[PDB]
Amino acid sequence: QIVVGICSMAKKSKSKPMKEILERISLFKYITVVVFEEEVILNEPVENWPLCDCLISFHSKGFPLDKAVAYAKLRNPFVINDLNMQYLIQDRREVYSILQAEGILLPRYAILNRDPNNPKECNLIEGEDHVEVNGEVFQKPFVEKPVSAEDHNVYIYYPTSAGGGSQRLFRKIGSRSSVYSPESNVRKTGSYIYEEFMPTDGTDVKVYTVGPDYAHAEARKSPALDGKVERDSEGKEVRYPVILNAREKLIAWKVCLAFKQTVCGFDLLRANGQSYVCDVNGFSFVKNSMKYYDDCAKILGNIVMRELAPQFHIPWS
Ligand SMILES: O=C(CP(=O)(O)O)O[C@@H]1[C@@H](OP(=O)(O)O)[C@H](OC(=O)CP(=O)(O)O)[C@H](OP(=O)(O)O)[C@H](OP(=O)(O)O)[C@H]1OP(=O)(O)O
Ligand SMILES: Nc1ncnc2c1ncn2[C@@H]1O[C@H](COP(=O)(O)OP(=O)(O)O)[C@@H](O)[C@H]1O
Ligand SMILES: [Mg+2]
Ligand SMILES: [Mg+2]
Ligand SMILES: [Mg+2]
Numbered sequence: 194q195i196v197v198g199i200c201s202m203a204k205k206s207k208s209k210p211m212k213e214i215l216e217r218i219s220l221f222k223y224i225t226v227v228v229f230e231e232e233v234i235l236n237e238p239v240e241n242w243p244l245c246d247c248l249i250s251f252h253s254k255g256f257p258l259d260k261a262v263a264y265a266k267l268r269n270p271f272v273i274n275d276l277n278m279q280y281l282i283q284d285r286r287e288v289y290s291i292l293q294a295e296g297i298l299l300p301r302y303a304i305l306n307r308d309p310n311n312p313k314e315c316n317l318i319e320g321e322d323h324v325e326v327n328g329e330v331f332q333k334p335f336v337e338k339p340v341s342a343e344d345h346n347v348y349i350y351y352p353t354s355a356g357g358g359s360q361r362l363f364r365k366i367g368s369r370s371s372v373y374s375p376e377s378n379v380r381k382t383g384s385y386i387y388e389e390f391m392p393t394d395g396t397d398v399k400v401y402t403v404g405p406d407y408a409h410a411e412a413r414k415s416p417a418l419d420g421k422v423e424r425d426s427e428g429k430e431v432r433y434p435v436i437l438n439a440r441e442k443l444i445a446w447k448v449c450l451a452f453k454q455t456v457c458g459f460d461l462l463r464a465n466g467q468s469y470v471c472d473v474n475g476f477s478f479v480k481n482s483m484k485y486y487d488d489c490a491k492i493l494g495n496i497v498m499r500e501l502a503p504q505f506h507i508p509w510s
Pocket of ligand 1: 399458474
């Protein structure tokens, strides 16, 4: 049997999307799925972790990535989502830097790094209707993101012509994803990426790859629009159908390969006749789509089989 190891926090390992997918991967005749217990992940040295031939593992809050890396180094499994890239995925500066290098369209941006030691020694000048970040001008509206990709406190600053003030996004709480603030001045402590605001039709397109040749997309109301979450009958955020164009499929292919995340979530902004990548989140499943559960499990199982069947002497075509 080929052993597929699943190594992530229990929150993720026991989520419905995960359970739906693992159950289908298990229908592969030569595959056995082992889900590492959270207790073992956090408290046992890697030497005691289960063996696997293929490792599916990803960082979310609380996950000891260092131990996942050390485990993979010890056992040398076939790695579905590269572990070291997951340090970089946590850092918007590194994410954006990879996108530029791969020739992927993204918003014009500039990084403001504030060294925690110095009192006031940053490269930032603020006007009423713009900022200058290391000399680079951004007219409002512009977007201000914490350099930590796990920090979802993204601010949008409105131009005086639109009434000034700001929109503060956050991790969804109930009916809301953002709120208006009369505050017009940028945040004064911490490091941030500043970027041009890309005018979309008020939705974000969310893309989910499973390998570089398969990508499901769907749209959701932009959190910055007014902050009210559209919910269905069952209190799940309303999603709208999307079909990617040729440019966007190529984008999905590049993102999946550039970050070495077979399973990969990222966000597109359809603006000005193009599509811009504004966020790459790594390992991420589509929810509430039976067909995605089927495709994803099938693709992953196929990848596993293609990769490992020869050394296991299993016929596979
Ligand atoms: O928002 C919620 C609560 P709800 O899903 O409304 O019950 O869960 C988010 C999940 O949202 P959705 O796709 O709408 O279900 C969030 O997912 C999204 O927002 C969609 P995407 O993953 O960003 O494409 C996201 O889930 P995944 O990363 O597991 O997908 C969040 O996980 P986190 O980032 O906090 O670890 C997860 O929060 P939590 O359940 O508190 O951990
Ligand atoms: N450059 C931009 N122009 C216009 N809207 C943006 C831009 N960047 C982000 N947004 C909006 O803000 C939301 C959150 O920003 P994102 O980069 O996805 O951060 P997070 O990692 O918290 O999701 C996006 O879903 C999108 O609606
Ligand atoms: Mg099986
Ligand atoms: Mg996002
Ligand atoms: Mg993100």
